[PDB]
With several copies, the nearest count.
Chain A
Amino acid sequence: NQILYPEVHLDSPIVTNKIVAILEYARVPHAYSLEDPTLCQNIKHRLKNGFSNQMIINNVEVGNVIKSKLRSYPAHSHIPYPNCNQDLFNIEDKESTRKIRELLKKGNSLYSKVSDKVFQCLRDTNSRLGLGSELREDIKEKIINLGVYMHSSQWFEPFLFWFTVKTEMRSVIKSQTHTCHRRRHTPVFFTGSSVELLISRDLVAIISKESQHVYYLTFELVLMYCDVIEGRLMTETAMTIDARYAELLGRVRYMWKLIDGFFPALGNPTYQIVAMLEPLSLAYLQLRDITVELRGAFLNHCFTEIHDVLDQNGFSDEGTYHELIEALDYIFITDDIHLTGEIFSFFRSFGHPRLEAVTAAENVRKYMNQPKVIVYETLMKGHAIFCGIIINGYRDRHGGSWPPLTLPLHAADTIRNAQASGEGLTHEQCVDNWKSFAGVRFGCFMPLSLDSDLTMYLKDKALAALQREWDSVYPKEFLRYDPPKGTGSRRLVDVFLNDSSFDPYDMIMYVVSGAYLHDPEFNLSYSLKEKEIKETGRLFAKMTYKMRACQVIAENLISNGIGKYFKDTYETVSAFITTDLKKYCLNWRYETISLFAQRLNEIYGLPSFFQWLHKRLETSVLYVSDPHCPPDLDAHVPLCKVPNDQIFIKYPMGGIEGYCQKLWTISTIPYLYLAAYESGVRIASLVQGDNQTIAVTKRVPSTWPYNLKKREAARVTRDYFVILRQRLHDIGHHLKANETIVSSHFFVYSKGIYYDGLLVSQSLKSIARCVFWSETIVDETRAACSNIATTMAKSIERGYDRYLAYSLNVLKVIQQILISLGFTINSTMTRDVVIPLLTNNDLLIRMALLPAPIGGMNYLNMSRLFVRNIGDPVTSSIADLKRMILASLMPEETLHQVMTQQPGDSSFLDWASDPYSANLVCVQSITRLLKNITARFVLIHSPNPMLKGLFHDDSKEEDERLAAFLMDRHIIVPRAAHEILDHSVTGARESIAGMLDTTKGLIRASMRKGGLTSRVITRLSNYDYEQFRAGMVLLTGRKRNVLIDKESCSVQLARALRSHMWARLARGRPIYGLEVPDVLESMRGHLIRRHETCVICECGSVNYGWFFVPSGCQLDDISRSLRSAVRIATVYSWAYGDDDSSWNEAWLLARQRANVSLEELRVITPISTSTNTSLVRVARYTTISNDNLSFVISDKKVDTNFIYQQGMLLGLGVLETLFRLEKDTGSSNTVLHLHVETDCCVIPMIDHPRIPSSRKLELRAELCTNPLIYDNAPL
C-alpha cells in the first residue's frame, strides 16, 4: 500500500472554492470574495450545527498556530492569488534552503571538473565532420562556464525556494497519510532570514518580514509555482547561453517585466490580456501583407478588444492605453519571420486563472436557449448538394451506377436520365433544380461493422451516478443535508469487464425501441478542465453507461462507414481564411440536422437512430458539479424540480462538443460548396485542432505581375467571404466578422504556423518542460534521466544548438542523480549506500556519464543528436564510450569493467519481447511492469462474453513454450521471434493488455482485492536500491580481458559482449542478424569552397554523398478483396519464410490464427528471395546527388546496410548547422562531400538454408472460437 507516492506535477484545475473552504475550516480571516454565497453559507451553517471529524480536528490546530504567530507583525495582509503573483516570483531566502544549496554547489563543482574535457570531445567530433578546426570562440566560454550561467540568473533563488517547499510537503504528506502511525504532533512555524514557512497537511502559509504581506496556498498552487519557475529558469538559461536569441531575449524580458506589473492592480482579468497573445501575433504577422488593403485588418479588432477590456475593468484613463499600445508595439514588431512565431511558446508561462463554477455554466445556459429562424430554400439547396455528393460517392467503386439507390418521383427528365443511364452529376444541376430531390427515399446498402476490435470501450473515461442518486459525488460536509450512497462505480473499464451479458446489437436495439427516452437512470454531468487560460474556459461532459456505449457505437458506425465518402496560359492562386470553431456546437438544431439524420437512418437500415442526441436532451436537465461547488438545496429532490439557475442547464437544444463529431463534420460541407458555386470559385477545407481553415483558389493568366495575382486572390475571397457569411446566417450559424482572419500568405496548423511554403516554429516550447522528476507512480531515476533526453532531442530539431543541448543534458543528469541520491522522500536509501556513493567523486560522475544500454545512467548518445533513429543501441553506446576514453573523459579501467561485468538472470521470453537489450541486472521500468502484472489478473478473471476463453490460467506457460520453440535452434534469431510472437495470439493478448491502461485508482483497487503478493510488493518497493548497488559493483569490479584491444571495432566488440553476457542460454551457439555499424564512427566530411581541392576525397576515399547549394540570397522570403483481421496471416507466413518441412508448422500457427487451408495460404502469400523531412529551411536550396554512393558492401539487392536515409539526414544536418546565423547565403556557392568507410564493420555472413526445428512443437489442443480473435470462419 506504501508504493504510491503523491503526484509531482500539476494536473487539476485551480478552483477558488477549495482554498476558501480550507481557510474557513481553519477559521482564519481572508480576503477572497465569491459570486455564489452557497459554499460559504452552507459550511457556516454546518459548523454552527457543530459536526466535525478527524480532518477538522487536524486543520484547526494549524489555524490556531497562525493566529498565535500573527501578532508579531501587526500590519499584515493577505494578498489573494493571482493579485499576489508579482512577489511570489521574486521571493527568496538564503537560510531556509541550505541543504539543497550545498547539493547543487557540489553538482556544479563536479560538472566544472570535466567541462573542459567535454568541450574537447565535442570539438573533436565537430572537426571530424570538416566543419572547421575550431567552433565559434564565443561558444567555448559558455560550454565551460555553463553552470556559472545557470547560477547567475534571476530565477535561481525562487526556484530553490519553491523546490524545497514542494519536496518538504511531499515528504510530510507521504509520511503521514499512511496509517502506520496515527498519533502526530503539529509542525512548528519555521524561521529564517526573511521568510517563515508553515507547512500544514494541506496548506502552506508564508509571511515575509519587511513587507509583512501574508500568503496562503495549497498543494496545487505549490506544484504550479514550482513548474512555472523551473520552466522560466531553463528557458532563460537556454536563451542566454545561445547567441541567435539576442534580441528575443530582451523582448521576452520586457514582456515579463511589464505584464508582471499589471497583476498587483488589474487582478484575475489579466488572464484576458494574456489570452490575447496569439491573435496579436497573427495580426502583427499580417502587417507585412502584400495587398495593402488587408494591413491592420485583424489588428483593428484586436486593439478594440484590448480597449474594451481596459475600459470595462475600470482604467478609464487613456494615457495608460496609449502606453500599453506602445509597449505591445515594441514587443511584437520585429524583422525576422522565424522569430515572429517564437512568442507562441511563452503563452503558458504566466500561470493559470482561478476559475469558479457558476461563471462557466452562465455562458452555455445563455448561448443555448435562444430562438432561431432559418430559410427553407437555402436548407433545401444544402440538402440537395449533400444528396448529390452521396450519389457520386456510391457511384464510384461500383462501375458508375445507382443500383440500390433512391427513386425520384417527379424530377426533371434531365436528372432522371442520369439515374437511368449511369453517368455522374455536379453541384450545378442540384443547386439549379433542387426541387427534384424534394421527396426521395433511399434503401439501406451498408453493413454495420461491429466486431473489429475492443479499443473504443476500453479507452478509460469517467461516468455519472444514476439519475435518482446524483448527490453522491459531493463529500458529506459541504451540503445542508446528508446525501445518499452511490453504488454504481465510476470506472468504465471495470463496469464493462465485470458484466455478464453483453452484445452490441442489444444497445442499438435499446435505442431503436425507444427505451432510451424512458430509461429512468440515464444522467449527464459537467466537470471543469485543467490548464486553461480563460475564466469561462471550457468544460467536458460525462454520462451514464448504456447511453455512453450507444453513443460511441454510433460514432464508430458513422466514422467507419459513410465517413470515408467525403475524404476527398492560366494557373491557380489561393488565399486563406482562418476562423475559430469553439461555441459552434451550441448552435445546431433539430430543424437543421433532421434531413441528414433521416438520410442516414435510410442508408444504414436502422430506423430513427441518428438523431438521438436532441431527442433525448430536450427532456433531460444538465448541470456542472465539482466536489467543492455545492448546489443550494434544502433536501434531496429529483433532477427535475431544480430551478434553471446558477449551476444547472434545463431543457437544452444545442449539442455537446465532441459527441457526434463526424455527423456535423460531414454535414457542414454542402454549405461550403453552395457558397463556392455562388461565387464561382473552387475551395478546400481543413480542421486542425480548434479552428477551421479554408483555402479559396482562382485561375488567372500566367504572365502577370505576381503582386497583381495576389491582389486578385484577395479581391475574389472578399466577395466569397461575404456570400458565405450571408448563407450561414440564413441557416442559423453566425460566423462572426472579427474573429476570422483573411490572409494572402499563411494559415496555422498543429506542427507550426505555415507561411508561404516555409514553416516557422517554436523551438523553446519543449525546453520549458524538462523537469527533475518524470510522471509515474514511483519516481525512478531511470525514468527521469530519459524524460530529460527525450525533450532535449525534441528541442534540438526545432532549431536549437546541438552542442549546447548536449552540455545542458549532461549538467541536468549530474544534477538529478545528486537529488535522487541525497535529497528525497524515499525510505529505502540506507546510510550504508548513501555514504559510500557521495564520499567518492570519480565513481559518481562515471556512473552519470556512462550510457544506459551498457549499464550507466545516461540516455542520450552522440549519434542521436543528428539522425532520428540510431542503428544498434548497444554498438552505438560502445562507440560513444570509445570516443569518451579517447578524448580522456574516463579512465581505461571502465571498458574492461563493462566487458567483464556480472550477468543477470532473465527468461527466454523477454529476449523475444525486446530483441536488442543485452540484459543487465534490474534495468526494467517499475510502472511498465506493474501495469502488466495488474492487468493480467483482471483480464483473466472477467466473464465478459466478448473475451471468453482467451485467458486461461496457464497463459504464461503456453507463452514461454511457444517462445522457446520459436527461439531455441542451432542459430538464434531474436528479430523474427519478436515479430512472429507479436503477430500471433500471444501478441494479441499483449496488445490488448497494454492498450488497456491503468492508474492509481485501479492499482489500489486491485491491491485491495489482493491480486499482488506481499513478496512482489517488497520486491517493487525495494527496487531503486538495486540499480545503485549494481552500478557500484560494476564500477568497482577489478577484472581484465586479454582479448580486448581497444582498437577492435564496435561491432566485433558488441558481439563478444552479448555472447559473454547471456551465454547461459546460447551455449556457444552464435547470435546473428542484430548489429549494424554506427553513423558517427564511419562518416567523414569536407566543405568544398570555390577554388580548392578535396583532401579526404583524394587521399583514397572514393564513395561520398554530394551536396550543392548556390549563392541564392534567401532566408528572408521567396479470392481476396478488402482484407480483414486475416492480414496477419500473410505477414506471419512471410516472416517464417520458405521452409519445406516447416511449412507444416507455419500452416499450423496460421490456422491457430484463423481458419484457412494450406493451399489458400500458399497461393495468397507472396514469395521473396529472403526468409528474413520538412523541419528545416536551407533544404529547399540544395541539390543532392548519390552518384558516388553506389559503392555499398557487396552492392546487393538487400536492405541498405548503412542507411542511405541516415546519410542524407546527416548531410542536411551539417549543411543546415553551417548557415544557422547569417541571413544571406554568402558570396559564392558551396559544395559538400560526405565520405564513408565501413570496412571494419563488415560481417562475413553465412546465410543458412533455415534453422531446422529442434523441439517437439506443442500448442493449445482446442483452436479458439472467440469472435474478436482472428476469424475462424472468414470465408
Chain B
Amino acid sequence: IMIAIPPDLKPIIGRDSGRALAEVLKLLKEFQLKPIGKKVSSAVGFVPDTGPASRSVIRSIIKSSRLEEDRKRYLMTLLDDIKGANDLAKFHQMLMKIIMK
C-alpha cells in the first residue's frame, strides 16, 4: 500500500493528503531521540570526555570533596599531566573510589 518505510513498512498518513513532505526525505525520515548512552556524558549519569568542562568539573569535585588539602594538591599535581580519554576515565574511577572511601 506504501513504499518500504522503516519492520521496513510503517505506513503514515498526514492530517491531509499532501503534508508529509517535511519528513519523507528530510532512510532520512526523522532525527529521532539520540540514544541515551552510559558512555556519552548525559544528565542521567556523569562520565568524562575530552572537553574542558570535564576537567573543570573534575577539579570542582576534588575541591568540594571532604578530602584533605595536602591530598587535594597531590591529585592536582597528578592530574595536570594526564591526557587521554581512557586514562582520564580510569583516574576518574580511582578518584570516585578514594572519595567514597
Contacts and interface: CB of A to CB of B under 8 A. Distances in A.
Q: Determine whether A and B are in direct contact in the complex, meaning some CB atoms lie less than 8 angstroms apart.
A: yes
Interface of A: 284, 287-288, 292-301, 303-304, 307, 318, 321-322, 325, 329, 333, 371-376, 379, 589-591, 594-595, 598, 653, 718, 721-722, 725-726, 729, 734, 737-738, 740-742
Contacts of B52: 307, 318, 321
B6 to A, nearest CB: 5
A301 B4 contact: no
A590 B4 CA distance: 7
B45 A376 contact: no
B23 A722 contact: no
B45 A598 contact: no
B61 A296 contact: yes
A329 B44 contact: no
Contacts of A725: 33, 36
Contacts of A722: 36, 44
Interface residues of B, number: 35
Nearest to B96: A292
A295 B3 contact: no
Interface in B43-77: 43-46, 51-54, 56-58, 60-61, 63-64
B79 interface: no
Given A287-B61, A303-B57, A329-B63, A297 B45 contact: yes
Contacts of B85: none
Contacts of A295: 46, 61, 96
Given A373-B4, A376-B2, A598-B3, A740 B60 contact: no
Given A287-B64, A718-B45, A737-B36, A371 B56 contact: no
Contact of B2 (A296, A321, A373): A373
B18 to A, nearest CB: 13
B2 A304 contact: no
Contact of A300 (B23, B30, B53, B99): B53
B98 to A, nearest CB: 10
B22 interface: yes
Contacts of B6: 371, 590-591, 594
B57 A299 contact: yes
A729 to B, nearest CB: 4
Contact of B5 (A297, A589, A718, A740): A589
A591 B64 contact: no
Contacts of B23: 371, 373
Contact of B54 (A300, A333, A742): A300
Contacts of B57: 296, 299-300, 303
A729 B6 CA distance: 17
A373 B53 contact: no
B83 interface: no
Nearest to A370: B22
Contact of A740 (B19, B32, B43): B43
A130 to B, nearest CB: 39
B15 interface: yes
A5 B5 CA distance: 54
Contacts of A379: 3-4
Nearest to B34: A737
A319 to B, nearest CB: 12
User: Which 7 pairs between the two chains have the least Cβ-Cβ distance?
Assistant: A296-B57, A594-B4, A371-B22, A729-B33, A303-B53, A292-B96, A297-B46
B25 interface: no
B33 A294 contact: no
Interface in B8-22: 12, 15, 19, 22
Given A322-B56, A333-B63, A737-B36, 6 more contacts: A297-B46, A298-B43, A300-B54, A374-B3, A590-B4, A737-B44
B43 A737 contact: yes
A379 B2 CA distance: 10
Contacts of B96: 292-293, 295
Given A284-B64, A293-B46, A303-B57, A372 B5 contact: yes
Nearest to B33: A729
A742 B60 contact: no
A737 B46 contact: no
A304 B45 contact: no
Contacts of A740: 43
Contacts of A718: 44-45
Given A292-B100, A298-B43, A742-B44, A304 B51 contact: yes
Contact of B46 (A300, A304, A321, A726): A300
Contacts of B58: 296
5 contacts: A296-B58, A376-B3, A379-B4, A737-B44, A742-B44
B3 A287 contact: no
Nearest to A304: B53
Nearest to A592: B4
Given A374-B2, A590-B6, A742-B43, A287 B60 contact: yes
A372 to B, nearest CB: 5
Nearest to B58: A296
Contacts of B3: 373-374, 376, 379, 591, 594-595, 598
Nearest to B22: A371
A325 B43 contact: no
Contact of B41 (A300, A318, A594, A726): A300
A335 to B, nearest CB: 9
Nearest to A707: B100
B1 interface: yes
A817 to B, nearest CB: 49
B80 to A, nearest CB: 13
Contacts of A292: 96, 99-100
Contacts of B45: 293-294, 297, 718
A721 B44 contact: yes
Contacts of A653: 5
A287 B3 CA distance: 43
Most buried by B among A294, A373, A734, A737: A373
Given A292-B96, A307-B52, A591 B15 contact: yes
Nearest to B2: A373
Nearest to B51: A304
A741 B4 CA distance: 32
A371 B4 contact: yes
Contacts of A333: 60, 63-64
Nearest to A611: B6
Nearest to B47: A293
Most buried by A among B33, B58, B100: B33
A288 B43 contact: no
Contact of A591 (B5, B33, B51, B56): B5
A594 B5 CA distance: 9
Contacts of A741: 43
B68 to A, nearest CB: 15
B46 A296 contact: yes
Contacts of A288: 64
Contacts of B36: 722, 725, 737
Contact of A297 (B30, B43, B99): B43
A292 B3 CA distance: 42
Nearest to B41: A300
A962 B4 CA distance: 60
B12 A373 contact: yes
A734 B5 contact: no
Contacts of A729: 32-33
Contacts of B4: 371-373, 379, 590-591, 594-595
Contacts of B41: 300
A371 B60 contact: no
B15 to A, nearest CB: 7
B27 to A, nearest CB: 16
